[PDB]
């Protein structure tokens, strides 16, 4: 449907030896296309998707300069955050932020995002209008007041409507075979007797893309929300994803349970019973 370019940035004050002071990974939808980091001030960049082989050398040369400047600015921000929060020196603190832009099926821009967190908690978020900010406390309220006085959201918008749109368009073009697809799940039910006479029914979904999915068990006349065990959707490592959901049921009543699967690649929810 719609397509998104996303970057996930992390800065660490006094990381461990050999660990990055700054790292960012970039995605189109659920496909990673690069890793950037800075260790002891040295920037490094690595491609991760096949379409990145088509980028010209200047792409990587400009990216390296961006990495150096971002890593120095994040380090400075972490130092000021320590002061405004009256925190002791020596400890290690974390600054994370996300950056994205989204286009619809016709490449029209639909939205964009900028949001930051400090030590794993929300700090500041850019609103849907792309012009105002939401803070969480009096420190982040200083940031908001400064960013609004200086009209900083204008330059984020220029980035969104400039490089973010440029890159999203070119990546989708060169990587169309990977990105413009929807692989539906392959589903089946597994049956495992338990030593007490009852039975585990495990509903599997494999090989689907994108990752968003839903699995649900249902009984004749009883809701199973609280009864069923779900695992977090997980990468198979080849581009696809997998998941399962399980319930314990008495032996002999297996055929009154049904597993429902919902996914983008399915025009209707799939239904499954044991055997």
């Amino acid at each position: 449907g719609s397509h998104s370019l996303r970057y996930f940035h992390t800065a660490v004050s006094r990381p461990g030896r050999g660990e990055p002071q700054y790292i960012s990974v970039g995605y189109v939808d659920d496909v990673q296309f690069q890793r950037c980091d800075s260790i002891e001030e040295i920037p490094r960049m690595e491609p991760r998707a096949p379409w990145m082989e088509k980028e010209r050398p200047e792409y990587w040369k400009e990216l390296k300069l961006k990495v150096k400047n971002i890593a120095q600015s994040a380090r400075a921000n972490l130092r000021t955050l320590l002061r405004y929060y009256n925190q002791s020196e020596g400890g290690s603190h974390i600054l994370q932020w996300m950056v994205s832009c989204e286009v619809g099926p016709d490449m029209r821009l639909l939205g964009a995002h900028y949001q930051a967190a400090y030590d794993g908690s929300d700090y500041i978020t850019l609103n849907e209008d792309l012009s105002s900010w939401t803070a969480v406390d009096m420190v982040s309220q200083i940031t908001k007041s400064r960013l609004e006085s200086a009209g900083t959201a204008e330059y984020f918008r220029a980035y969104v409507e400039g490089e973010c749109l440029e890159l999203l368009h070119r990546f989708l073009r060169n990587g169309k075979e990977i990105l413009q697809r929807a692989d539906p799940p392959k589903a089946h039910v597994a049956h495992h007797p338990r030593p007490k006479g009852d039975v585990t029914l495990r509903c599997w979904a494999l090989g689907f893309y994108p990752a968003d999915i839903t699995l649900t068990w249902q009984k004749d006349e009883e809701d199973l929300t609280q009864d069923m065990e779900l695992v977090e959707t997980r990468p198979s490592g080849d581009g696809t994803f997998q998941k399962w959901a399980a319930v314990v049921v008495p032996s002999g009543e297996e055929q009154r349970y049904t597993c429902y699967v919902h996914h983008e690649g399915l025009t209707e929810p799939l239904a499954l019973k044991w055997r």
Partner: peptide
């Protein structure tokens, strides 16, 4: 690949 100065 964009960063905003917090403080």
């Amino acid at each position: 690949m964009f960063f905003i100065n917090i403080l």
